[PDB]
Structure formats: C-alpha cells, structure tokens
Amino acid sequence: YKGFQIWTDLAPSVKEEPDLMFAKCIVQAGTDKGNLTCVQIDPPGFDEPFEVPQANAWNVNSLIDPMTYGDIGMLPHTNIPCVLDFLKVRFMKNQIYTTADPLVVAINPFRDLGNTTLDWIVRYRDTFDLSKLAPHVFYTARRALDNLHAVNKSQTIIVSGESGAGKTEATKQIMRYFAAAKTGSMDLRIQNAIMAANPVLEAFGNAKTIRNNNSSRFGRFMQLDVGREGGIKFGSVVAFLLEKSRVLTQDEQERSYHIFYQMCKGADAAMKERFHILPLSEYKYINPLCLDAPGIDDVAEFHEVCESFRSMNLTEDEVASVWSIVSGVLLLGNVEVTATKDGGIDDAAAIEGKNLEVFKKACGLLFLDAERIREELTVKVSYAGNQEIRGRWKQEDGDMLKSSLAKAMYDKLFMWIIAVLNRSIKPPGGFKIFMGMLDIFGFEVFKNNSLEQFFINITNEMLQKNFVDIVFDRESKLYRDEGVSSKELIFTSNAEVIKILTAKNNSVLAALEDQCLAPGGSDEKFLSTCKNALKGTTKFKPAKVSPNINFLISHTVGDIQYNAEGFLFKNKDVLRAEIMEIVQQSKNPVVAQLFAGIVGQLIGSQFLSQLQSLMELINSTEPHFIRCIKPNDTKKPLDWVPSKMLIQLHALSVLEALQLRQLGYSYRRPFKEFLFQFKFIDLSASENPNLDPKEAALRLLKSSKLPSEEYQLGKTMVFLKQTGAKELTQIQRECLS
Ligand SMILES: Nc1ncnc2c1ncn2[C@@H]1O[C@H](COP(=O)(O)OP(=O)(O)O)[C@@H](O)[C@H]1O
Numbered sequence: 243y244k245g246f247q248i249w250t251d252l253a254p255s256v257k258e259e260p261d262l263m264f265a266k267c268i269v270q271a272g273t274d275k276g277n278l279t280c281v282q283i284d285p286p287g288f289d290e291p292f293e294v295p296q297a298n299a300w301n302v303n304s305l306i307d308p309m310t311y312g313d314i315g316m317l318p319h320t321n322i323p324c325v326l327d328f329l330k331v332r333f334m335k336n337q338i339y340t341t342a343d344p345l346v347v348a349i350n351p352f353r354d355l356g357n358t359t360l361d362w363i364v365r366y367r368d369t370f371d372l373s374k375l376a377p378h379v380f381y382t383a384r385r386a387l388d389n390l391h392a393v394n395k396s397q398t399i400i401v402s403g404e405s406g407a408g409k410t411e412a413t414k415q416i417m418r419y420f421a422a423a424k425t426g427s428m429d430l431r432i433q434n435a436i437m438a439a440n441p442v443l444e445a446f447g448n449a450k451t452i453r454n455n456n457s458s459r460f461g462r463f464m465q466l467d468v469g470r471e472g473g474i475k476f477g478s479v480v481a482f483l484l485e486k487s488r489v490l491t492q493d494e495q496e497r498s499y500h501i502f503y504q505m506c507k508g509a510d511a512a513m514k515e516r517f518h519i520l521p522l523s524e525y526k527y528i529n530p531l532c533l534d535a536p537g538i539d540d541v542a543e544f545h546e547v548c549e550s551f552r553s554m555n556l557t558e559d560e561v562a563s564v565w566s567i568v569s570g571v572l573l574l575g576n577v578e579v580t581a582t583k584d585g586g587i588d589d590a591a592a593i594e595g596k597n598l599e600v601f602k603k604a605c606g607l608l609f610l611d612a613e614r615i616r617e618e619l620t621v622k623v624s625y626a627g628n629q630e631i632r633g634r635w636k637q638e639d640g641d642m643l644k645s646s647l648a649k650a651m652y653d654k655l656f657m658w659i660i661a662v663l664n665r666s667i668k669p670p671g672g673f674k675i676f677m678g679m680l681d682i683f684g685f686e687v688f689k690n691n692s693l694e695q696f697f698i699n700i701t702n703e704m705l706q707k708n709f710v711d712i713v714f715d716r717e718s719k720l721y722r723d724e725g726v727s728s729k730e731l732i733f734t735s736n737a738e739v740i741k742i743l744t745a746k747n748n749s750v751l752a753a754l755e756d757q758c759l760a761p762g763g764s765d766e767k768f769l770s771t772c773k774n775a776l777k778g779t780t781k782f783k784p785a786k787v788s789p790n791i792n793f794l795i796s797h798t799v800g801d802i803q804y805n806a807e808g809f810l811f812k813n814k815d816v817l818r819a820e821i822m823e824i825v826q827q828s829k830n831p832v833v834a835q836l837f838a839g840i841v842g843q844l845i846g847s848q849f850l851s852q853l854q855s856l857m858e859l860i861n862s863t864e865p866h867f868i869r870c871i872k873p874n875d876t877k878k879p880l881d882w883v884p885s886k887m888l889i890q891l892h893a894l895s896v897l898e899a900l901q902l903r904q905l906g907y908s909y910r911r912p913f914k915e916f917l918f919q920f921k922f923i924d925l926s927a928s929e930n931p932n933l934d935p936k937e938a939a940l941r942l943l944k945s946s947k948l949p950s951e952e953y954q955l956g957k958t959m960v961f962l963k964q965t966g967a968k969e970l971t972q973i974q975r976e977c978l979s
C-alpha cells in the first residue's frame with residue numbers, strides 16, 4: 243500500500259556509508275509482497291538499478307513542502323526515514339524547532355540564526371489571536387505563561403538532551419522572552435539582576451568540554467514570577483552538584499571553569515599585582531595545553547561579569563573579596579606538600595621553604611589563618627584509646643586536604659554568590675504560584691568516565707523516568723480512570739535501570755553509600771558488592787576491559803562504561819570540620835559566610851535527596867518538555883549525521899510521542915479549573931455556587947455551542963480536543979462594562 247518512491251534499508255549508498263541510514267529511490271517495477279526494482283536519486287551518486295525486498299521499503303512523503311508542517315504527527319507518513327528527512331530539510335533551511343504532541347524538538351544550529359532577537363520575541367508574544375507562526379521555544383514560553391495566568395497554576399519548562407544540544411541556550415532564550423514586556427511598566431532592577439546573573443553562573447559553573455565548549459558543570463533550577471503581560475518580577479536560583487574535581491585537574495583538551503581564564507587574561511596590571519595573579523601556564527591547577535575556548539572571548543566575559551556584579555548589588559568590597567578567593571584557589575595548587583622527616587616510613591607531610599612563602603600568600607588571599615591551616619594539613623591528633631597522640635599526616639593525605647580546601651572554597655563561593663542573588667530577588671511574600679525552569683546537565687560520554695559523569699548521567703535517567711511517568715504512564719492511566727479512552731499505549735521505560743542505580747538497597751548508589759560509611763573501604767570492594775548485591779539484571783554489567791575497577795551501565799542513550807577509581811574519595815569530598823571551623827573564624831565577611839551556620843553528608847546521598855525534593859516540587863506543577871538534539875559531533879553548522887539524530891530521537895522519545903494523538907484529547911482539566919478558565923462564556927453557569935460542577939461545565943459548554951465531538955466529560959474532568967481549546971479561548975471576547 244505504498245507509492246512510487248520508497249526509502250530503503252538495503253541500498254548501495256547505505257551499505258557503503260552506514261552513517262547515513264536511508265536512501266530515497268523511485269520504483270520501476272515490482273508487485274505486492276514481492277521484490278522491487280528501483281534506482282536511488284536522493285544520493286545522486288548511484289545512477290544504476292538495484293533490487294530491494296518488499297520489506298525494507300517505506301513511503302516517502304514526496305509532495306510535501308516540509309516548511310509548512312510544524313508537527314511530526316501531521317505528516318502523512320511518519321516512519322523513521324521520513325521523520326529523519328523531515329527534520330533534515332527543515333534544519334538545512336534554518337528551521338530547527340518542530341513540535342511532537344506536547345513535546346518540542348530543538349536541533350543545535352551551532353550559529354546564531356538570528357531567530358531569537360527582540361523582533362522575534364515581540365512577534366511570538368503579542369501577535370493577536372493564537373500562535374500561527376512556526377514552532378519555537380517561544381511557543382513553549384507563551385503557552386506555559388498563558389496556562390499560568392489562565393488557571394493560576396504553576397508551570398515548569400524542562401529542557402533535555404545530551405551535552406552540547408542547546409539546553410542552556412534555549413533556557414537563556416526563554417528568559418529573554420519572559421523579560422520582554424513593552425505592554426506594561428515595572429522596576430527594571432530585579433529583572434536586570436536575573437539576566438545579569440547568567441554570565442557569572444556560566445563563568446563560575448561552566449567550562450570547556452570536548453562535548454561542549456560552554457558545558458555547564460552544574461544543574462540549575464529557577465522559580466520565576468513572570469508578569470501578566472511579560473516581564474520578570476521575582477525569582478530564585480538553585481545550583482546543585484558543582485563539579486569541584488574540575489578545580490584540581492582537567493583533561494588535555496578541556497579547560498577549568500571560565501572564571502579562572504577571565505581573571506588571568508582580563509585583569510588589569512593593578513589587579514594582577516593586588517591579588518598576586520600569575521599567568522595561566524604557572525598554575526599547576528590549570529591545564530596548560532588548552533587555554534582557549536573557541537566560542538568565548540575570555541577578556542570580554544571578564545568585563546561582562548564585572549558589570550554583572552554591580553547589577554546583583556555586590557559592594558566593591560565583596561567584588562574585590564571574590565577575586566581574591568578565586569586567585570587564592572588557583573595559587574593554593576602551587577603549594578607543594580613536600581615529604582619531611584620524623585615520619586614512620588619517611589612519609590610525613592609538611593610545607594617548607596618556598597612552598598611556605600606561597601602557602602602564606604595564598605592563605606592571605608583566602609583570608610585564612612595560615613599557621614592554623616598548616617597545622618591541620620600536617621599534624622593529625624589521634625586517640626589510641628585513652629592515649630592522645632600527635633601523629634603526622636602522610637604526604638598523600640596532607641595534599642588531598644590542601645586541595646580539598648581549594649575545592650570547598652570555590653564550591654561555597656559559587657553558592658554564596660547565588661545566595662547573594664536570591665536575597666535581592668526572592669519575592670517578599672514567597673512562592674505559591676510560579677514559573678519553573680530546569681537547566682540540567684545533559685548526558686555525557688568520555689573515554690574515561692568518573693563520578694562526575696556518573697552523577698550527571700543518573701540525573702538524566704531520573705528526568706526521563708519523570709518524563710515517561712508524567713507524559714505516558716500517568717496520562718494513559720488517567721484517561722482510562724476517567725472513562726475517556728481505554729487504549730493500549732505501549733512505550734519504553736527506564737524503570738529497571740533507575741532501580742538498580744538509585745534504590746534504597748540493591749543499587750549502585752546504595753552500594754556506594756555503604757562503602758563510604760565503613761571505616762576501611764575501597765573502590766574495588768564497592769564494585770565487588772555491586773557485582774553480587776543484584777546481578778540478575780542486564781542493566782548493570784561488569785566491563786569487558788579491566789573488570790575489577792571498570793563497570794558499564796545500559797543507559798537509555800546507549801551503554802556507558804565507568805571506572806570506580808576515586809569513587810570513595812570523590813564521594814566523601816567534604817571539607818573537614820577542623821578545617822571548616824578555621825574558614826568560619828575568618829575576619830573577612832564573605833569568607834565567614836561561606837560555611838556559616840554549619841557544625842549523611844556524602845555527596846551521593848545529599849544529592850539524590852535534593853533530586854527527590856526537586857522532583858516533588860516540579861511534579862506539583864504542569865510540565866512542558868523541550869527535547870534538544872545535537873545533529874553532529876563536530877559542532878559544524880548544517881552538518882547532519884542521521885545515525886546520531888536517530889539515537890537521540892529514540893532516547894528523547896520523540897518517535898514514541900506520536901502515540902499521544904491516538905490518546906483522545908489534548909486538554910484535560912478538572913471541572914472547577916475549567917469553569918474558572920472560561921468563566922465569561924456563561925457567567926451564570928460558572929459563578930453559581932449552588933450548582934454541580936459537571937452540570938455547570940456542561941451548561942457552559944452548551945452555551946459555547948462547541949460541537950459535540952470536540953469535548954467529552956470524564957468522571958471528574960472535562961476533556962476536549964485541540965480544536966475545542968482554541969475556540970473557547972477565542973469566544974472569551976465579550977466586553978463586560
Ligand atoms: N539555538 C541555538 N542557536 C545558536 N547556537 C546554539 C543554539 N543552541 C546551542 N547552540 C550552540 O551550542 C553550544 C552548546 O549549547 P548549550 O546550551 O551549552 O548545550 P547544553 O545542552 O549542553 O547546555 C553553545 O555554545 C551554542 O554556541
């Protein structure tokens with residue numbers, strides 16, 4: 243039942259270059275359930291005939307203008323080679339946004355197309371009636387903002403994808419849309435502090451990665467109070483799981499956080515001498531092979547984050563205090579912890595000579611008591627029963643504790659700047675009804691994946707479980723429980739991999755936590771208990787190469803191999819109490835507030851707990867999903883890799899979405915919410931307290947004269963199609979006094 247053009251799985255140009263997965267060919271002969279003789283044209287290289295079975299042949303969508311179809315579902319033929327070609331043609335014409343049911347897909351162009359300027363914001367925000375432009379992320383922003391004010395219910399925009407897909411860039415674009423309000427008038431200062439925060443959060447939190455030159459090394463969540471006619475009034479920012487290990491070491495092709503390069507390269511000579519700023523090559527903490535990020539002007543961002551500090555109401559004392567801590571964090575890595583005498587195996591740690599001259603100058607930059615810190619890095623008081631002993635630290639421990647100071651100072655400074663931001667911006671009353679935004683670090687894969695990547699990929703798995711539960715599991719169950727539709731909706735879940743990773747027991751994070759709670763623990767003993775706590779699952783497997791320390795997980799985006807070397811050390815990377823209480827007693831105001839109020843606390847345990855707390859908040863809101871896709875690995879514009887596109891389409895469930903059109907209606911809201919959203923259609927039916935909400939909704943629907951097939955009444959909700967929601971919003975045009 244197919245036309246004259248087919249897509250081919252077994253073709254000459256696809257068997258020769260499997261990365262491009264399909265060829266388009268015109269059928270010259272054949273029959274139903276017989277072999278077909280056809281020649282391919284879309285790769286014009288092969289001008290000769292060949293044969294293909296009846297299978298491995300899909301319809302083409304030959305006559306469509308792909309620039310006129312905004313949704314994948316609206317295409318006549320929605321098979322894999324059609325969806326791939328549909329997104330390709332639109333992407334080659336610089337149209338990257340394409341909707342799929344509630345989902346919206348955004349493909350990285352790797353260049354500013356100019357489609358997010360202020361003129362585009364105005365055209366998507368205030369064009370009368372409804373959105374009849376092309377799909378966009380401004381689609382999501384306006385629909386979510388309209389839903390917010392129409393029902394008084396919190397919404398949450400959630401971007402997703404892999405590293406370098408455009409999650410953060412889409413987030414910044416939606417903030418620019420929300421911040422645009424030419425209809426009303428407000429005080430600019432709070433909104434300007436929110437927008438000016440984006441540079442400093444990317445300076446302190448982002449760094450060059452082979453997968454993304456501006457990779458966010460932290461997750462971001464934002465609650466927003468967006469005005470009715472646009473404009474941002476209040477907000478709050480939360481950053482979780484900053485990767486402190488990046489402060490110490492980096493791969494050869496990567497950089498540390500941008501702020502180190504902005505400072506060393508952009509600081510004036512007076513500032514360099516003031517905070518003892520060395521060139522980047524003379525910092526052990528800075529990878530000297532890669533000092534340049536292709537898309538970033540480090541000197542331009544340096545003056546950008548300097549002006550941003552003023553918009554966030556940081557006094558000149560605090561700004562100078564921040565640069566001192568940044569330089570102090572860098573200089574601390576130059577302190578060599580030399581091995582000294584009076585050690586058991588000549589292993590005792592100490593700082594001497596030129597290292598102590600550097601150590602004193604670094605502590606002064608960090609505003610710390612030098613000799614009190616030095617004692618905590620060198621001597622270790624222990625208790626063999628009732629015997630107090632002033633033993634020494636081995637060189638290994640003293641060096642880790644020294645680097646631990648630099649990481650905690652940088653980690654807490656990043657949180658303190660955000661906390662300074664929230665004090666100036668958080669709403670005076672509180673957050674009851676808000677606009678949520680989630681900017682999570684995406685899936686990432688390297689030749690060597692440590693705990694930094696393990697946590698990041700686990701966050702992405704939990705989001706997908708929350709995606710599948712909300713969009714597929716809850717929706718399919720809700721329709722059946724309402725009596726609207728009994729449908730056999732089948733999909734791909736990640737419930738088994740999320741269990742063997744995050745459960746209370748019989749999971750990787752559980753085996754990690756128990757290993758760190760032991761007096762004597764090893765990375766290999768942690769992987770050992772993983773191999774047998776539960777091995778009856780294909781989601782966890784011992785790696786094929788070096789299986790004593792390496793393991794791999796069968797993720798939703800493929801298989802990823804991790805190595806446990808350093809898991810315990812990195813999972814227990816908390817500043818010691820005896821060192822933390824020294825930086826608390828600093829006479830410098832900002833340093834004294836970094837650890838203020840502090841007197842279980844493992845990263846993996848305190849980070850999964852925050853994820854659950856954030857999952858509970860977000861699920862109290864109505865979610866909107868943006869699926870960001872990276873079309874190539876070379877970051878080249880107009881570069882299209884069909885094999886990579888298809889992997890992300892399965893991972894983000896863009897193809898599996900299309901089932902949702904078969905699941906009845908697109909609008910589903912309780913009777914009371916519906917009567918409030920369209921109350922002016924029949925005020926006698928909506929504002930009558932002595933009425934039954936199902937009859938009142940029916941009276942309002944029958945007053946709207948909406949056709950019968952465009953709505954339905956469930957047991958406790960009113961369902962209606964995409965056509966019915968458009969009309970009711972339009973009918974609310976009557977003018978009351
Ligand atoms: N819509 C877009 N327009 C132009 N460039 C983009 C767009 N989305 C992503 N990019 C480019 O891709 C890079 C990575 O985007 P980013 O949002 O950091 O990815 P991630 O999803 O990892 O946060 C950015 O530096 C930017 O240059």
Ligand code: ALF
Pocket residue numbers: 404405406409410453454456457458459681682683684685
């Ligand atoms: F900056 Al990313 F995933 F690389 F959010």
Ligand SMILES: [Mg+2]
Pocket residue numbers: 409410457458681682683684
């Ligand atoms: Mg990001």
